[PDB]
Amino acid sequence: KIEEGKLVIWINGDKGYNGLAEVGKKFEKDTGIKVTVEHPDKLEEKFPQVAATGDGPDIIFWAHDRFGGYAQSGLLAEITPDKAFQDKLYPFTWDAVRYNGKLIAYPIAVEALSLIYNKDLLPNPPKTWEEIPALDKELKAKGKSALMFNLQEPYFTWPLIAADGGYAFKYENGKYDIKDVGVDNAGAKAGLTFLVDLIKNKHMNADTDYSIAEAAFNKGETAMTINGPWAWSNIDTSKVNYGVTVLPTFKGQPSKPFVGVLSAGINAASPNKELAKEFLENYLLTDEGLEAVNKDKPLGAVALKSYEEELAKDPRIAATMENAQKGEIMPNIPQMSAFWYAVRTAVINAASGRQTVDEALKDAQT
């Protein structure tokens, strides 16, 4: 079972886990309590299983959309910081981690995807998606591609699908209607159709994943990519002269990425709940704590007001916020996992030609 007297933390391998480990080391030096940070694969899927038996990490980090499902299963401890502490973070970030009237995690950062481009290959990035095919043709004649991003995770294609009207669950009367989905409406069909056509016209490969896309952009093989703040560190190391800006528009409409609030939840079966709260409230959610993680891998716009003010000057953060505002905060309801799996299958099947765009989305709707 979970050992008492130590803290085990899980966070995605793409995030600044080494920076988080430094915060853990400071905690141990001050309290004598050991902190172990790990970054398992598919941790958001592994947590429910291990936490079910009553095991798993003391703290789990992930975008808030997965937390509602965890709470419904009773896998998360309710957190109750005093109102004063709550005032140190933006009000909307707390709403993102509120389920059935109870807070179920500590918000850490607001993540939104942006268009990242190579200034040496494209000084002026396209304002619309409709311009990409012509731009790719031109660049292809030069041995390069216009755009490459992860097509295996729906998170990355969603901004285009939602651009012309696609949506997950209809929100009415103050609640999400699970039975009213917008993944197969006119707008969603138009968006995925455009993406599939880009593939059919050899402007993108249906097998492109995170690693492939990252390598391509960092090696200067593609003029643009779509990714989040965490990716900036690797790009800085590649020394590519890049810019981060607003995603291209589709049919005159801005792209609408699903906005995630990176959050830290506490395992309901943990015998170290108060220790976890002290680590999160007194060490991580401080300017110095977030800086340590951010220095490792950019968190993007943080939930902590005091630190966000310091990151506001960064043009890359301004672009992140601009895209976030054009998109929408993800719901945290339990049905989100079904939604994500459904869209993932639809995109992969349509992109690979296993199904027509219309039928792939019709099935995602169901």
Binding site: A168, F169, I178, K179, D180, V181, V183, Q335, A338, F339, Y341, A342, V343, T345, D363, A364, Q365, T366
Partner: peptide, 6 residues
Amino acid sequence: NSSSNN
């Protein structure tokens, strides 16, 4: 699929 299982 998005609207399935309760």
